[PDB]
Ligand binder design. Structure first.
Ligand SMILES: O=C(O)/C=C/c1ccc(N2CCCC2=O)cc1
Lengths: 300, 237
């Protein structure tokens, strides 16, 4: 188990760690988060009490380095940093732990939620979507735009998701216009899977990352990407059976974790009704259809 | 975007544009089978592609053999329409290619957009005009060439005959639409009006009769009266 210490908490803030969130008041003995499960990526995120504008946060993997948080009063945010002095870091963490000044990552033994949401998500792939090569962790916030959003404006601060566009020459073979528009299998299997992603695990990783950025930051371009990647699969008549079964599991856990009160803003009615009831794969997502119909029957 | 009565004069500016109407591409008769089921029999159709400024009509005749062994024909017909319009554009010299293509039915937007991805500068637009181009098969010379066709064929016409020698394209289009609306609403009476007078004939190289300016005024009034008469018959007014 690993630890993200905090130098201090100078401003009141709601702190998220993966799907958990807790409040720290403007000066308390708060010195970080311990018992973080090794083996997964994690996200530590922030919403300031006095300015809910900008949710922001950091994707990281404790196996890649020793990371801590320190408030910057000039830029007005909690910043992640790497500590290269390993003996310094271990002594700092030991003291805060001996002082019970860290909150515990509050994982229930039975609870596989975080694994089920991040099964295919890798730090290396996150760092290609979020380009800041001098850091081992990746900053994301509520307002960052995607490369596709920019094409339709600072490129260094963008989310470089893979562009999906159903009415593009990439999606449609000359001479197969009707075929490729009504059946996206070419675009899914040859262009995206064989061509760009190389395998379904990298596809699912980006799909999962997009969902998590939409949910944790309210990032609109991420929500668009998540729905695009779902619709691309559901609108293909030919999908490997293992991908369909895995997608059903992926979506089930995403819908199960979504806060009920954010459903109006995180779920696209058109995409979900098309995917569950009209698409080629309308009968292939039994777990996802069951939870959607019991939890969000209004959207359907 | 969409094309309506606000920007109506845009039709007659100097930006080349075409209307495309697909309503006569897939045509069928419905009949009973010997077992008492119902079956369709296709008949020859056409794509109606018109330059409203010049009157040039590119009539692609759709021969029934294009449907043989195909499924979902009403959907196929939209994509075949789009394929043929794309092929027409590619066949034209660059300086004759349209800058806009206006589809009379919104279901043609995606098929035409997908076929024209190679022409990102040609705008594909719907219209809020209700244009009576389905009645083109009430023009005898057009119906004749479609029904006689034994294979796919493109035939070129000028749907305004020689009218642009005497009137603007705005007025020619308004005359065409009134004529086609009348033929759509009551074909028999409209053809009665157009042909009643034997001393006014259709030139071999024309589609409509050789009316003088004064006779066109009379004809147009008679067509409006027909439309109005039919409106009153329909709604009991
Ligand atoms: O929002 C909540 O429900 C809890 C908030 C919370 C709980 C515990 C702490 N701790 C633990 C170590 C020192 C410290 O300050 C800080 C916030």
């Amino acid at each position: 188990m690993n630890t993200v210490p905090f130098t201090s908490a100078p401003i009141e803030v709601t702190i998220g760690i993966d799907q958990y969130s807790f409040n720290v008041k403007e000066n308390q003995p708060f010195h970080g988060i311990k018992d973080i499960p090794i083996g997964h990526v994690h996200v530590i995120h922030f919403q300031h009490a006095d300015n809910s504008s900008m949710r922001y946060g950091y994707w990281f993997d404790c196996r890649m380095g020793n990371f801590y948080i320190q408030y910057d009063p000039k830029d007005g945010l909690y910043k992640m940093m790497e500590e290269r002095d390993g003996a310094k870091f271990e002594n700092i963490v030991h003291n805060f732990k001996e002082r019970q000044m860290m909150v515990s990552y509050p994982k229930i033994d039975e609870d596989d939620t975080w694994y089920n949401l991040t099964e295919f998500v890798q730090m290396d792939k996150i760092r290609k979507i979020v380009r800041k090569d001098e850091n081992q962790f990746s900053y994301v916030d509520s307002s960052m735009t995607t490369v596709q959003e920019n094409e339709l404006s600072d490129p260094a601060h963008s989310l470089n998701y893979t562009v999906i566009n159903f009415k593009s020459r990439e999606a449609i073979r000359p001479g197969h216009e009707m075929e490729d528009f009504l059946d996206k299998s070419y675009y899914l299997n040859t262009v995206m899977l064989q061509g760009i992603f190389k395998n379904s695990s990298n596809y699912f990783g980006e799909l999962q990352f997009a969902f998590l950025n939409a949910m944790f930051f309210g990032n609109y371009g991420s929500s668009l990407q998540w729905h695009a990647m779902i619709e691309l699969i559901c609108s293909s008549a030919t999908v490997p059976k293992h991908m369909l079964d895995k997608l059903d599991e992926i979506l089930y856990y995403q819908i199960k974790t979504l806060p009920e009160q954010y459903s109006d803003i995180l779920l696209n009615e058109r995409v979900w009704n098309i995917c569950l009831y009209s698409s080629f794969q309308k009968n292939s997502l039994h777990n996802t259809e069951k939870i959607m119909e019991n939890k969000y029957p209004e959207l359907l | 975007g969409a094309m309506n009565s606000s920007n109506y004069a845009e039709l007659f500016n100097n930006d080349i544009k075409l209307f495309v109407d697909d309503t006569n591409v897939y045509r069928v008769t419905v009949h009973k089978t010997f077992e008492g089921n119902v079956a369709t029999k296709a008949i020859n159709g056409c794509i109606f592609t018109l330059n409203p400024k010049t009157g040039h009509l590119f009539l692609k005749i759709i021969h029934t053999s294009v449907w043989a062994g195909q499924k979902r024909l009403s959907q196929l017909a939209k994509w075949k329409t789009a394929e043929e319009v794309s092929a027409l554009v590619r066949s034209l010299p660059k300086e004759e290619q349209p800058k806009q293509i206006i589809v009379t039915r919104k279901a043609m937007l995606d098929p035409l957009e997908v076929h024209m991805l190679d022409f990102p500068n040609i705008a594909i637009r719907p219209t809020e005009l209700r244009l009576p181009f389905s009645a083109a098969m009430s023009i005898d010379k057009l119906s004749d060439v479609v029904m006689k066709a034994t294979e796919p064929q493109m035939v070129l016409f000028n749907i305004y005959d020689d009218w642009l020698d005497r009137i603007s394209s705005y007025t020619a289009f308004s005359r065409l639409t009134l004529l086609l609306r009348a033929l759509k609403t009551n074909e028999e009476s409209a053809k009665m009006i157009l042909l009643s007078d034997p001393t006014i004939t259709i030139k071999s190289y024309h589609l409509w009769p050789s009316f003088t300016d004064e006779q066109w005024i009379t004809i147009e009034s008679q067509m409006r009266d027909l439309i109005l008469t039919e409106y009153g018959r329909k709604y009991n007014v």
